[PDB]
Design an enzyme around this catalytic site. Structure first.
Site, mmCIF file in Angstrom:
data_model
loop_
_atom_site.group_PDB
_atom_site.id
_atom_site.type_symbol
_atom_site.label_atom_id
_atom_site.label_comp_id
_atom_site.label_asym_id
_atom_site.label_seq_id
_atom_site.Cartn_x
_atom_site.Cartn_y
_atom_site.Cartn_z
ATOM 1 N N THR A 93 -2.570 3.021 12.294
ATOM 2 C CA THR A 93 -1.620 2.450 11.337
ATOM 3 C C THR A 93 -1.667 3.226 10.087
ATOM 4 O O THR A 93 -2.641 3.987 9.952
ATOM 5 C CB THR A 93 -1.998 0.965 10.588
ATOM 6 N N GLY A 94 -0.698 3.383 9.108
ATOM 7 C CA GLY A 94 -0.898 3.967 8.106
ATOM 8 C C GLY A 94 -0.227 3.214 6.911
ATOM 9 O O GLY A 94 0.899 2.810 7.044
ATOM 10 N N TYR A 146 -13.982 0.164 6.737
ATOM 11 C CA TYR A 146 -13.203 1.220 6.663
ATOM 12 C C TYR A 146 -13.279 2.066 5.226
ATOM 13 O O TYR A 146 -13.162 1.451 4.301
ATOM 14 C CB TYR A 146 -11.654 0.610 6.834
ATOM 15 N N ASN A 184 2.648 -2.117 -0.311
ATOM 16 C CA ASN A 184 2.192 -3.175 -1.168
ATOM 17 C C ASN A 184 2.991 -4.423 -1.098
ATOM 18 O O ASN A 184 3.461 -4.866 -1.995
ATOM 19 C CB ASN A 184 1.939 -2.747 -2.610
ATOM 20 N N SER A 195 -2.559 7.138 7.119
ATOM 21 C CA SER A 195 -3.977 6.981 7.691
ATOM 22 C C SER A 195 -3.720 7.260 9.051
ATOM 23 O O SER A 195 -4.647 7.546 9.934
ATOM 24 C CB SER A 195 -4.582 5.828 7.538
ATOM 25 N N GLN A 249 -5.030 -1.142 -9.691
ATOM 26 C CA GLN A 249 -3.678 -1.395 -10.292
ATOM 27 C C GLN A 249 -2.830 -0.496 -9.171
ATOM 28 O O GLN A 249 -2.840 0.669 -9.625
ATOM 29 C CB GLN A 249 -3.590 -1.340 -11.748
ATOM 30 N N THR A 250 -1.875 -1.008 -8.538
ATOM 31 C CA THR A 250 -1.236 -0.352 -7.761
ATOM 32 C C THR A 250 -0.140 0.653 -8.063
ATOM 33 O O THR A 250 -0.509 2.027 -7.859
ATOM 34 C CB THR A 250 -0.346 -1.290 -6.808
#
Length: 345
Positions: A297-298, A157, A325, A60, A120-121
Site C-alpha cells: 500500500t501507499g 512500521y 487523510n 510507500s 498536523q496534516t
C-alpha cells in the site's frame, strides 16, 4: 481464481467518491484479460476526468522497489541480510545489533521521524513539501528519539527503515537510487510510466492531481500534487501507473526479479495483524474468501494506492484514489482487492 467482479469494483469507486475522493480508479490484469474502471476527476478545479492511464505518486509502494534492489545485491554477494547495518554504514545507528533484515521487515525499532513531521496534516505537508533532505538528515531526525523496541523484537512500521535502505543501496553500488531503480527494474520491465525524479516536484506526463484532506472535518481540500517527497525518498518517492505496478508485482511474484532463494526470504512473514503480514519490503493481505495477495500500500499526500498480486503473479490489481487523510476512502478502496480476487459474493 474466481472471476473479478466489475460491478463490485464500480460500487467501491462510487462509494469512495461519496466519501470525498475526487477520483478513484482500478486496473486488474487477470492472466492477460484486462479490467479497468475509473470514476471522478484527476483535477477537481478543471474537472478533467481521472483515467487508469494517469500517473500518480505511489508512496510507500516504493519500499518494494527498494527491497528488490537490495535483494538483487544479496544475490550478487554484496549484502548479507543478517549483517549489522553499521557494518556497511559505520556509526550510522546507535546499536550495532540492528541488522539489514530487521530494517527491511520493520523490526529494527527505529523511530519513524514522520510522526514528528505530520502531527498536523496540512501544516506538516506545508513544512516539508519544498524541502530537500539528505538521507543522513532523516536518520538524525529519527535518532533524536529512542528506539521503540529491541533489535528484531517487534514489528513497528517505520519510514526510517527504508531511508536506511536507500543509504545502503547508494553506499554499496556507488550509484544513486534513481540509477539503480532504472537499471534493475524500470528498464528491464519496460515500466514506461514509472519514475524516480527526487527532488523534482513535477510529475512527468498526464497525471492525477493529489488532494490532501485537512484535519478539520468538511475543510477545503489542498492540492498536494507537486512536492519533493524528500522526506521519504527510497521509502516513498516513486511515480507510476496502474499498468506498471501490475507489471512490477506480477514480475516479482512470478520469480522474474531475483533468485528463488531471495524471493523466499522476501516472503518470510512477520505478523502485522490477524489478516496481514510484512516480509522484506512486501505486504501480505488475507482476503475474506481465503485468498492471500502480495504487494504494498501507499499513502503520500493526496494519494492512496493499493497494489497486490496473487501468489503466482497471474492476477494483479492496482487501485488509486487521489485523496489522503480520509480513512473512509482508505477503507473503501481496500475493497477493490475483495472484488478483484474474491469476485461476486
Amino acid at each position: 481464481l474466481p472471476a473479478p467482479d466489475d460491478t463490485g469494483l464500480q460500487a467501491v469507486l462510487h462509494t469512495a467518491l461519496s466519501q470525498g475522493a475526487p477520483g478513484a480508479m482500478v486496473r486488474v490484469d487477470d492472466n492477460g484479460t484486462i479490467h479497468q474502471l475509473s470514476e471522478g476527476v484527476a483535477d477537481r478545479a478543471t474537472g478533467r476526468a481521472i483515467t487508469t492511464t494517469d500517473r500518480f505518486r505511489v508512496g510507500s509502494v516504493t519500499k518494494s522497489f527498494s527491497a528488490v534492489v537490495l535483494l538483487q545485491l544479496v544475490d550478487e554477494g554484496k549484502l548479507d541480510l543478517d549483517a549489522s547495518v553499521n557494518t556497511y554504514l559505520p556509526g550510522l545507528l546507535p546499536d550495532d545489533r540492528i541488522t539489514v533484515r530487521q530494517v527491511m521487515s520493520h523490526r529494527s525499532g527505529l523511530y519513524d521521524y514522520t510522526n514528528d513531521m505530520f502531527a498536523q496534516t496540512v501544516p506538516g505537508f506545508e513544512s516539508v513539501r519544498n524541502k530537500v533532505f539528505s538521507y543522513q538528515d532523516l536518520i538524525t531526525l529519527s535518532l533524536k528519539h529512542g528506539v521503540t523496541n529491541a533489535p528484531g523484537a517487534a514489528y513497528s512500521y517505520s519510514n526510517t527503515n527504508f531511508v536506511v535502505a536507500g543509504m545502503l543501496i547508494e553506499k554499496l553500488t556507488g550509484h544513486s537510487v534513481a540509477t539503480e531503480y532504472q537499471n534493475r527494474i524500470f528498464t528491464p520491465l519496460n515500466l514506461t510510466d514509472t519514475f524516480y525524479v527526487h527532488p523534482d516536484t513535477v510529475i512527468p506526463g498526464t497525471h492525477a492531481n493529489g488532494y490532501l484532506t485537512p484535519d478539520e472535518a468538511g475543510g477545503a481540500l489542498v492540492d498536494s500534487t507537486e512536492q519533493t517527497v524528500s522526506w521519504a525518498q527510497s521509502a516513498g518517492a516513486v511515480i507510476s501507473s496502474t499498468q506498471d505496478l501490475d507489471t512490477f508485482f506480477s514480475a516479482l511474484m512470478s520469480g522474474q526479479l531475483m533468485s528463488a532463494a531471495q524471493l523466499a526470504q522476501m516472503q518470510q512473514w512477520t505478523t502485522v495483524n490477524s489478516t496481514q503480514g510484512y516480509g522484506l519490503g512486501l505486504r501480505r493481505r488475507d482476503l475474506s474468501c481465503g485468498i492471500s495477495v502480495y504487494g504494498h500500500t501507499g499513502t503520500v499526500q493526496g494519494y492512496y494506492t493499493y497494489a497486490f498480486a496473487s501468489k503466482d503473479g497471474k492476477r494483479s490489481v492496482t487501485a488509486l484514489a487521489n485523496t489522503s487523510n480520509n480513512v473512509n476512502v482508505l477503507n473503501t478502496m481496500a475493497r477493490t482487492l475483495e472484488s478483484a480476487f474474491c469476485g461476486k459474493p
